[PDB]
Design an enzyme around this catalytic site. Structure first.
Site, PDB file in Angstrom:
ATOM      1  CG  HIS A  64      -2.033  -1.032   1.100  1.00  0.00           C
ATOM      2  ND1 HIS A  64      -2.472  -1.744   2.186  1.00  0.00           N
ATOM      3  CD2 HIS A  64      -2.746  -1.400   0.006  1.00  0.00           C
ATOM      4  CE1 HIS A  64      -3.439  -2.524   1.740  1.00  0.00           C
ATOM      5  NE2 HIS A  64      -3.643  -2.352   0.426  1.00  0.00           N
ATOM      6  CB  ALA A  65       1.045   3.944  -2.540  1.00  0.00           C
ATOM      7  NE  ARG A  66      -3.783   4.866   2.771  1.00  0.00           N
ATOM      8  CZ  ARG A  66      -5.068   5.192   2.710  1.00  0.00           C
ATOM      9  NH1 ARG A  66      -5.426   6.349   2.167  1.00  0.00           N
ATOM     10  NH2 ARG A  66      -5.990   4.376   3.201  1.00  0.00           N
ATOM     11  CD  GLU A  67      -0.392   0.318   4.452  1.00  0.00           C
ATOM     12  OE1 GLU A  67       0.327  -0.695   4.571  1.00  0.00           O
ATOM     13  OE2 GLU A  67      -1.624   0.271   4.301  1.00  0.00           O
ATOM     14  NE  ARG A 122      -6.450   0.105   0.496  1.00  0.00           N
ATOM     15  CZ  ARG A 122      -6.077  -0.540   1.597  1.00  0.00           C
ATOM     16  NH1 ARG A 122      -5.315   0.069   2.490  1.00  0.00           N
ATOM     17  NH2 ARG A 122      -6.514  -1.766   1.834  1.00  0.00           N
ATOM     18  CG  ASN A 139      -3.693  -7.294   1.453  1.00  0.00           C
ATOM     19  OD1 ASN A 139      -3.208  -8.363   1.068  1.00  0.00           O
ATOM     20  ND2 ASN A 139      -3.893  -7.022   2.732  1.00  0.00           N
ATOM     21  NE  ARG A 140      -9.962  -5.403   1.143  1.00  0.00           N
ATOM     22  CZ  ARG A 140      -9.041  -5.057   2.040  1.00  0.00           C
ATOM     23  NH1 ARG A 140      -7.791  -5.483   1.914  1.00  0.00           N
ATOM     24  NH2 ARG A 140      -9.366  -4.271   3.057  1.00  0.00           N
ATOM     25  CG  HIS A 192       0.049  -4.170   5.109  1.00  0.00           C
ATOM     26  ND1 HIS A 192      -0.762  -3.615   4.151  1.00  0.00           N
ATOM     27  CD2 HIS A 192       0.409  -5.420   4.725  1.00  0.00           C
ATOM     28  CE1 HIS A 192      -0.883  -4.527   3.205  1.00  0.00           C
ATOM     29  NE2 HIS A 192      -0.192  -5.639   3.501  1.00  0.00           N
ATOM     30  CE1 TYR A 194      -3.090   4.672   9.841  1.00  0.00           C
ATOM     31  CE2 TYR A 194      -3.709   4.102  12.087  1.00  0.00           C
ATOM     32  CZ  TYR A 194      -4.001   4.710  10.880  1.00  0.00           C
ATOM     33  OH  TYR A 194      -5.208   5.342  10.702  1.00  0.00           O
ATOM     34  CE1 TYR A 244      -9.987  -3.926   6.562  1.00  0.00           C
ATOM     35  CE2 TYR A 244      -9.715  -2.453   8.426  1.00  0.00           C
ATOM     36  CZ  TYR A 244      -9.363  -2.848   7.154  1.00  0.00           C
ATOM     37  OH  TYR A 244      -8.359  -2.180   6.481  1.00  0.00           O
ATOM     38  CD  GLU A 266      -1.782  -3.480   9.128  1.00  0.00           C
ATOM     39  OE1 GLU A 266      -1.353  -2.316   9.024  1.00  0.00           O
ATOM     40  OE2 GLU A 266      -2.355  -4.080   8.193  1.00  0.00           O
TER      41      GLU A 266
END
Ligand SMILES: CC(C)[C@H](NS(=O)(=O)CCc1ccccc1)P(=O)(O)C[C@H](C(=O)O)c1cccc(CN)c1
Ligand SMILES: [Zn+2]
Length: 304
Positions: A64-67, A122, A139-140, A192, A194, A244, A266
């Site tokens: 995920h790009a922003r992580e 993301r 990740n989906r 990943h 956070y 989730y 995370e």
């Protein structure tokens, strides 16, 4: 100019992968397992004492790009491996008995996008039909109860599951590499941020994994080990109930392929800074995460 205590852009990370390989040519090899939608090379590092048919642990960062702390960790990990191999008993044994496959950034197109246009992006950066919206949630996008729950069929959404399982070139490339090496790969770790958790299957259903006992015990031990350094508190458990439901995840897919040790990490923090974690926290975050990763490596090695 590269630093392990700053966030580095793709050009710099890409140069780093070549640099670290050229400096440790007998400890590290580099491969491109594919290309992104935009044509960038998806690099994978193999780290360990060269030897025939060794088991391996597979770790990726940057789904995920922003992580950004994720990307920073894969780099931190590789440096630690190199610095301590040859004179720290544990890591020396680790890299003697097995290899590490480190994929420093999977979603390269998105990472570049977060450096150039939108820090909070993301998804991937591939085009969609019927809409002007861009990107699929990697990740989906895996063949694990794909798009059955916890994903969006709307291409404008952040959890869009894609046109079809492995529709994305990045997820296909990763899935293809692992399929070919299912024989040697004994553990799968995906990094990943956070929220400070260790997750294991399942996320695409509230169904619990066969060795739910073994995994829950390992995660509990890992988080206790991590907290020793700075007191950082992690939670843990099966994905669907600990965070989730999210179908199509790479960790669930890895586990259904026969990789019985499959974890999602995370990292820091718990939302005070979120994805924009201060650079001043990179070192501390990476140091404590190493303790958990090494604890898992030691275990997998022992029960190999
Ligand atoms: C902060 C962290 C928890 C991330 N979550 S996120 O960026 O808010 C997901 C995007 C989102 C944002 C708003 C509403 C619905 C979804 P993540 O992206 O790293 C969580 C990860 C995922 O959603 O892919 C996740 C969730 C559940 C299970 C697993 C393990 N496969 C992995
Ligand atoms: Zn993520």
């Amino acid at each position: 100019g590269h630093s392990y205590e700053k966030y580095n852009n793709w050009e710099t990370i890409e140069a780093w992968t070549k640099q670290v390989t050229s400096e440790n040519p007998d400890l590290i090899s580099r491969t491109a397992i594919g290309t992104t939608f935009l044509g960038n090379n998806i690099y994978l590092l193999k780290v360990g004492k060269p030897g025939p048919n060794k088991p391996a642990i597979f770790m990726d960062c940057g789904f995920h790009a922003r992580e950004w702390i994720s990307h920073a960790f894969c780099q931190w990990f590789v440096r630690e491996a190199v610095l301590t191999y040859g004179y720290e008993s544990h890591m020396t044994e680790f890299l003697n008995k097995l290899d590490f496959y480190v994929l420093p950034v999977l979603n390269i197109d998105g990472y570049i996008y977060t450096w150039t246009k939108n820090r909070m992006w993301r998804k991937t950066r591939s085009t969609n039909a019927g809409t002007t919206c861009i990107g699929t949630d990697p990740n989906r996008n895996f063949d694990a109860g794909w798009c059955t729950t916890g994903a969006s069929t709307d291409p404008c959404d952040e959890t869009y599951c894609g046109s079809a399982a492995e529709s994305e070139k990045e997820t296909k490339a990763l899935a293809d590499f692992i399929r070919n090496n299912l024989s040697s790969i004994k553990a799968y770790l995906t990094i990943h941020s956070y929220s400070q958790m260790i997750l294991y299957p399942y996320s695409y259903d509230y169904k619990l994994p066969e060795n739910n006992a073994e995994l829950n015990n390992l995660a509990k031990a890992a988080v206790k080990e991590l907290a020793t350094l700075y007191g950082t508190k992690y939670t843990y458990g099966p994905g669907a109930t600990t965070i989730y439901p999210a179908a199509g995840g790479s960790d669930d897919w890895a586990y259904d392929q026969g990789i019985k040790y499959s974890f999602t990490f995370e990292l820091r923090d718990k939302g005070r800074y979120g994805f924009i974690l201060p650079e001043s926290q990179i070192q501390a975050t990476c140091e404590e995460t190493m303790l958990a990763i090494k604890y898992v490596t030691n275990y997998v090695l022992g029960h190999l």
